[PDB]
Amino acid sequence: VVGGTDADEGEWPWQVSLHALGQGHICGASLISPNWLVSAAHCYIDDRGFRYSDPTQWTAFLGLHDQSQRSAPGVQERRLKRIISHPFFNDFTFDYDIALLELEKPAEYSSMVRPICLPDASHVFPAGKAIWVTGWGHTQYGGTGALILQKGEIRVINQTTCENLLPQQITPRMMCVGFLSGGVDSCQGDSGGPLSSVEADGRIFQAGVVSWGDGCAQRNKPGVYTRLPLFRDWIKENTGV
Amino acid sequence: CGLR
Ligand SMILES: N=C(N)c1cccc(OC[C@H](NS(=O)(=O)c2ccc3ccccc3c2)C(=O)N2CCC(CCN)CC2)c1
The CATH number of whichever domain residue A224 belongs to comes to: 2.40.10.10
Residue from the list A10, A11, A115 with its beta carbon closest to the beta carbon of B1: A115
Of A199, A12, A230, nearest to A121 by C-alpha is A230
CA angle at A240 for the pair A63 and A42, rounded to the nearest 5°: 60
For A32-121, list the strands marked E by DSSP.
36-39, 58-62, 76-85, 99-103
Q: How many CA atoms lie within 13 A of A209 on its CB side?
A: 34
Going by their DSSP bridges, the two strands A204-212 and A223-226 should be labelled as: antiparallel
Which string of b and e fits A121-133 if b means at least 16 CB within 10 Å?
eeeebeeeeebbb
The answer to whether the beta carbons of residues A17 and A136 sit under 8 Å apart is: yes
Mark whether A67 and A172 lie in a shared domain.
no
Identify the domain containing residue A51 by its residue range.
Answer: 13-115+230-241
3-state class (DSSP) for residue A66: strand
Q: Number of folded domains in chain A? A: 2
Q: CA A182, CA A220: separation in Å to the nearest integer?
A: 7
Mark whether A124 and A175 lie in a shared domain.
yes
Q: CA A80, CA A56: separation in Å to the nearest integer?
A: 6
Mark whether A76 and A163 lie in a shared domain.
no
Q: CA A211, CA A122: separation in Å to the nearest integer?
A: 22
Q: Is A68 a catalytic residue?
A: no
Q: Separation of B3 CA from ligand 1 center, angstroms?
A: 30
- Cα four-point dihedral sign A221, A223, A229, A230: positive
Specify the amino acid at residue A112. M
Burial class (CB in 10 A: 0-12, 13-18, 19+), A185: buried
Strand partners, A145: A138
Mark whether A132 and A212 lie in a shared domain.
yes
Mark whether A215 and A168 lie in a shared domain.
yes
Residue A16 φ/ψ region, left for φ over 0, alpha for ψ in the -120 to 50 degree band, beta for the rest: beta
| DSSP code for B2 | -
3-state class (DSSP) for residue A85: strand
Q: CA A153, CA A240: separation in Å to the nearest integer?
A: 31
Specify the amino acid at residue A12. W
Catalytic residue, candidates A95, A97, A185, A190: A97
**Chain-centroid distance, C-alpha A165:** 22
Mark whether A208 and A241 lie in a shared domain.
no
Q: CA A143, CA A241: separation in Å to the nearest integer?
A: 37
Q: Indicate which technique resolved this structure.
A: X-ray
Mark whether A109 and A125 lie in a shared domain.
no
Q: CA A120, CA A99: separation in Å to the nearest integer?
A: 18
Q: CA B2, CA A45: separation in Å to the nearest integer?
A: 30
Resolution in A: 1.9
Of A31, A26, A2, nearest to A196 by C-alpha is A31
Q: CA A123, CA A226: separation in Å to the nearest integer?
A: 15
CA angle at A174 for the pair A169 and A180, rounded to the nearest 5°: 75
Residue from the list A111, A117, A202 with its beta carbon closest to the beta carbon of B1: A117
Mark whether A214 and A124 lie in a shared domain.
yes
Q: CA A15, CA A38: separation in Å to the nearest integer?
A: 10
Q: CA A66, CA A146: separation in Å to the nearest integer?
A: 8
Mark whether A153 and A166 lie in a shared domain.
yes
Mark whether A81 and A195 lie in a shared domain.
no
- Helix count (H) and strand count (E) of chain A? 2, 13
User: What stretches of chain A show up as alpha helix (H) in DSSP?
Assistant: 159-165, 232-239
Mark whether A161 and A136 lie in a shared domain.
yes
Going by their DSSP bridges, the two strands A150-156 and A204-212 should be labelled as: unpaired
Q: Is A53 a catalytic residue?
A: no
Mark whether A190 and A204 lie in a shared domain.
yes
Nearby residues of A31 by Cβ (< 8 Å), 6 or more positions away: A13, A14, A16, A37, A62, A107, A113, A114, A115, A116
Q: CA A174, CA A195: separation in Å to the nearest integer?
A: 13
Query: What is Dmax (Cα atoms) for chain B?
Result: 9
